[PDB]
Assembly symmetry: D2
């Protein structure tokens, strides 16, 4: 999908997020699951 | 000053769109209100 | 809206999330007619 | 480690997912991150 955005700072923020969303897909699921388990102790 | 982004994954697109909306809409908020808002947040975290 | 809390590891991460939290909360302050116009433009863009 | 508050359940869920992607991204081996960035340029 393509997205357009006004403002350089906005673009740079969205670019970092796009990257993190796409990169985390490379993380082995057992590590992702362990991470989420840790979240249960940090947030409701 | 517009930029274009490409993203893979419909969920990913949807999240980014929500943030695009908030970042762009925030631009419409008169600066007095942004200032007051930020002052308030200093006691909250 | 109800209040929620999250913890974040990393200053860089914290700063990004704070910027997004700000935008998500501040968009609530934009008068509805301007939100409507914004959405109107986005449909064309 | 920092903490923030946010108003609204949908806002919380959005931030939580971004928090997850930001924090997990750091587990990706650097050579793999470099490979991904190369891919974004070369294609």
């Amino acid at each position: 999908y393509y997205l357009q955005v006004r403002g350089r700072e906005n673009f740079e923020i969205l670019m970092k997020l796009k990257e993190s969303l796409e990169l985390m897909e490379l993380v082995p699921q057992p590590l992702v699951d362990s991470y989420r388990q840790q979240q249960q102790l940090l947030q409701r």
